[PDB]
């Protein structure tokens, strides 16, 4: 996260760290949506241009964390994966369209002060909240600059009008994406960066005071460049796929 702050303890209890076994390294962020299911970006697991193709046994999910590198004894839980599910029409060839993957944990994690699931939006939560100008919140342990934090970072960013998003890039934008960030003139900064991939963009509903995950950190061109924006997987647009996977498996 570029131009963010240290998270408070328990501020994002759904935040998950994707962790490579060997070399032991942070792969990506992710989010806890039930006691057994983790949501992330498909490109965290599968990206052939970079020869990235992780399987279940390549991976550990760490939940309840605050410190990036410490093993947080009696606070974090580390889980093994049972099954990874990538969207069948994830487009790694062109524009990361449908950048979404589910991971089923080998056993259910127990919730605590530090570990708690985020909600997934319904149609009318999406309609109400996913509006240009409304701010969401992104969290992660990724790079501070386009260097790495000791502690979970947090930044709040406004949704950006769809035409502004399109005019900022040569990449073809789809309806399964939205972009967030301050305009150059707005005089506030901040962005996700490398290592934040797969993490949650969340908003707090003013109607029921719950946190909803609206986006997944997907892609950007640089980190916190002026006139550039962060692009996020549109979680509600792909919730039908989510529901399908979860109650099939």
């Amino acid at each position: 996260i570029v131009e963010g702050s240290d998270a408070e303890i328990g501020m994002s209890p759904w935040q998950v760290m994707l962790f490579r076994k060997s070399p032991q390294e942070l792969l990506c962020g992710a989010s806890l949506i039930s006691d057994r299911w983790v949501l992330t970006a498909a490109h965290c697991l599968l990206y052939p241009p970079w020869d990235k193709n992780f399987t279940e046994n390549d991976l550990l999910v760490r939940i309840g964390k605050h410190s990036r590198t410490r093993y947080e004894r009696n606070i974090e839980k580390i889980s093994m994966l049972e099954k990874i599910y990538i969207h069948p029409r994830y487009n790694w060839r062109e524009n990361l369209d449908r950048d979404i993957a589910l991971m089923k944990l080998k056993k259910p994690v127990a919730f605590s002060d530090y570990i708690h699931p985020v909600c997934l939006p319904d149609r009318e939560t999406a309609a109400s909240l996913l509006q240009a100008g409304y701010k969401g919140r992104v969290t992660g342990w990724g790079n501070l600059k386009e260097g790495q934090p000791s502690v979970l970072q947090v930044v709040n960013l406004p949704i950006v009008e769809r035409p502004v998003c399109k005019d900022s890039t040569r990449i073809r934008i789809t309806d399964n994406m939205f972009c967030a960030g301050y305009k150059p003139d707005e005089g506030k900064r901040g962005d996700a960066c490398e290592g934040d991939s797969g993490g949650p963009f969340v908003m707090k509903s003013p109607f029921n005071n719950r946190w909803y995950q609206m986006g997944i950190v997907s892609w950007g061109e640089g980190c916190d460049r002026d006139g550039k924006y962060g692009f996020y997987t549109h979680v509600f647009r792909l919730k039908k796929w989510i529901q399908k996977v979860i109650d099939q498996f």
Binding site: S22, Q24, T69, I78
Partner: peptide, 11 residues
């Protein structure tokens, strides 16, 4: 950089 996790997990 990363502190070693319990080998129980790396199994």
């Amino acid at each position: 950089d990363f502190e070693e996790i319990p080998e129980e997990y790396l199994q």
